[model samples]
Target chain A: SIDVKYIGVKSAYVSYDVQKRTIYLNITNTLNITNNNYYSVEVENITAQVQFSKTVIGKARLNNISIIGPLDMKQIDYTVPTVIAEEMSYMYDFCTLISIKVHNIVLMMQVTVTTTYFGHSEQISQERYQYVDCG
Target chain B: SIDVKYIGVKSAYVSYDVQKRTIYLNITNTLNITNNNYYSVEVENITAQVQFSKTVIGKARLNNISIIGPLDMKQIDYTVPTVIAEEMSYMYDFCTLISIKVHNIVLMMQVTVTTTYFGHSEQISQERYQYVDCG
Candidate 1:
């Protein structure tokens, strides 16, 4: 099966630094153009929203790029950071304030992309979900 | 396939606390006897080795238990703990000493069991692998 609507975060690696009490997130974003038109694609005005549960915690803005492929697939890696005062603050402030548990703190990544291919413009937005352990 | 030699760790969960600089591992050990005989089994003197590579890092001793069923199946849960003075000590002392990377830390669990029927004693051991991020 071929699809042209595959622009989102593929995988995420969530890690925390205990010494600094900060969260380090490595995200792999993918852009796929697997239709018959196997031409070069242009993507621009990319922005990402990092959310825990339904609350937005962080945001990231990326640069414009061009992707070329027969099955045109390109992966972009981005690192995002989030910091709080204490470790328990994640459970109390982040979880309790947002009404989520420590283990239920789902790392949600949402990205919006404006793409141009074959002189046609398409706006695509997608979200990916992953979990980070705070216990 | 019905194999009497089916005894080992089924799954493992690895987590760490930055505040305590401790590694918490929860292991799930499984015993499956799904042959025509369908006799009971005995598991005793169980000891586990936590290894980074070929090097043994920590040891765990589990309690003796009896598993009985027509198609006998049991899952034993064990929690093992490992601590380091400093977080980076895992990289310097544990990883460096074993010549393994921080993400290459593998947790291995093993057990030996005997049979009640036919007076046959079987020694079974199994190992599991998982990664803990120290970055």
Candidate 2:
């Protein structure tokens, strides 16, 4: 592979704080993400959406639901897992609420990366997040 | 590849809440980790440690420091990154204070999977985490 220089949110870390009934999302390198690239992730047994505000506010537009890869993993070549459905709600006509429910989460995730000129591609793999709690 | 089963914390997720000053630790499959297997992660620009209690408590072992990989990546064959050191303190002389500091973590992580019967092996790859903060 060529030593090409690319930029984006290198990694992300997540965990749930039960003490205050809040979910924490840590995004490193906030300036890496560009407007030409798009990335999305879904949870199976969770009800939620993503907000990228600087101060962690939950007011982001969710619209145009689309399956990045096959929704059924049983029949797919890569058995990493699958996306069951892409749900969307635009009731208030102001924003489009998008949520994706997936199959068994033990099977990792299927990531699809698309760029303005490079087109789209995907990979299925497993990853472990670093969980921490300090007093 | 052998289909042997070794038990350990398959994955860990962590995030911090600025407003509440609370940290969250989400360990998927609590029943998977065994006594023999060990996994630890640390941040270069953060003050924290890991506690694997049922709830996200900040009390746990923080001793017995060790490095499973090269501490300097610039000199290593694989240019992933390096582990600077593993910090620990038996404050109350109760828990093992284990914290791993590393070089510029811009590169991916190096994971090692060792089995009782099988020898130790590692792979350097990139993994992304799912970030969520819902209202």
Candidate 3:
């Protein structure tokens, strides 16, 4: 299983709920699946976790599920739940600088897929990087 | 074998020999090689032919030769010796219109590579398309 390599980002922004004093990082994640095998592979569990520089941050669950055939490449969209930005103060400051100065919201991620081939069940985990607009 | 997917064009132009009244399509072709196999492959012969609107045109011989390892993707440049453009009047007229209208010089190409795996030698031919700025 090859992992997501971001072609483009749909949306990324910060939203504040002043009444609840909560600020969140809202973003959509698009994952690329390249099934290079000679046979079909079915998706069991699709999950992902985000890392920044080195620290782990948001976790997400993918809603799309299907079987991919050999020599097939596809991209699907998923949502990473709103991450409380204030809780990760350092990340908040980093993204603020990135948003104003103009740069990609650099994201390093590890995506895991649950699949079995020939009755052999195993998890195929792949790592890939992506970029998003910081605003 | 995975074939040539053009990532970019290095140079493409027209050259005229006034003495001979010969117009030539001078072009540099850059081809992308994506080695997806688990084993390495050695280059035997790397050659290509250009096709426009499905009609064949110039042919080229590659200058670089090397072994490409598994999971490696690379782009290499080769020169197609001057093609007498006037011989293909329809193509020459097509490109002239493209150039003045600020459009791409649409190129469809077929690339062939000679290689072997486990002592089995065979030729792999692949086709793809690319766009060049017309001017």
**Model 2 off-target regions past 4 Å?**
A1-91, A98-135, B1-115, B123-135
Model 3: per-residue Cα lDDT over A1-135, one tens digit each = 232122121211211112232222342323333323232233223233222122222343323434322222234222222222222122212222111122212221111121111212222112222322232
Candidate 2 per-residue lDDT, tens place, A1-135, comes to: 111112132222333223444444443322121123222222122233232212232444434434222222232121222222223421111221222222223322211221111112222233444332222
The CA lDDT at A15 in model 2 is: 33
Worst 10 residues of 1 chain A by lDDT: A110-119
- For candidate 2, the TM-score of chain A alone relative to the native chain A: 0.11
lDDT of each: 0.24, 0.26, 0.24
RMSD of 2: 33.3
Worst 10 contiguous positions by lDDT, candidate 2 chain B: B110-119
RMSD of 1: 33.9
Q: Quality of candidate 1's docking, in CAPRI categories?
A: incorrect
Error of 2 at A9 (Å): 13
Q: Rank the candidate models, highest DockQ first.
A: 2, 1, 3
lDDT of 3 by residue, B1-135 (tens): 222122121211211112233222332323333323342333223233222122222343323334322222234232222222222122212221111112212222111121111112222222222322232
Q: In model 1, which regions exceed 4 Å deviation?
A: A9-127, A133-135, B1-73, B81-135
Whole-model alpha-carbon lDDT for candidate 1: 0.24
What's the lDDT for candidate 3?
0.24
Candidate 1, residues B1-135, lDDT tens digits: the string is 113221231211221213444442342323332223222223122233221112122343323433322222234222222332322121212221211112222221111121111112222222233322222
